[PDB]
Amino acid sequence: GSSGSSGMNYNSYMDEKNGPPPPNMTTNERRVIVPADPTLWTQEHVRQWLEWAIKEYSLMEIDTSFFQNMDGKELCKMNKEDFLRATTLYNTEVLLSHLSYLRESSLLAYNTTSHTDQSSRLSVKEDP
């Protein structure tokens, strides 16, 4: 007769080989600026934040004793008036705005999520 087999596979793959150190570039090392929302803050997040803003924004003459051990939730209840008693208006606008900016992000965080979640189980490694 007269018959054959005309048909190629045509495919590709990767080996994923990594060379010796040093590595490409660092990523993270126990560094966090915010947990999530201003309502779920800790006693430290209330301090580190202030010490940070005063540095970045480079403010001057601001109450610190007020944020020595204030509840993260209280920071939200604080209004232009409450904040005015702690610092000037110019500063109150720099704080309230920041605390309000974080919330503006949550507006997008609210997702339906159709069975697309993932558990967290990442632990640091060491030794050969």
Swiss-Prot record:
Signal peptide: none annotated. The chain holds residues 100 to 220 of 452 of the full protein. Sequence-specific transcriptional activator. Recognizes the DNA sequence 5'-C[CA]GGAAGT-3'. This is Friend leukemia integration 1 transcription factor. It is linked to Ewing sarcoma: A highly malignant, metastatic, primitive small round cell tumor of bone and soft tissue that affects children and adolescents. It belongs to the Ewing sarcoma family of tumors, a group of morphologically heterogeneous neoplasms that share the same cytogenetic features. They are considered neural tumors derived from cells of the neural crest. Ewing sarcoma represents the less differentiated form of the tumors. The lineage of its organism: Eukaryota, Metazoa, Chordata, Craniata, Vertebrata. Located on a fragment of chromosome 11 flanked on the centromeric side by the acute lymphoblastic leukemia-associated t(4;11)(q21;q23) translocation breakpoint and on the telomeric side by the Ewing- and neuroepithelioma-associated t(11;22) (q24;q12) breakpoint. Belongs to the ETS family. Residues 20-106 form the PNT domain. Can form homodimers or heterodimers with ETV6/TEL1. It is found in: Nucleus. It comes from the Eukaryota. Coiled coil: none annotated.
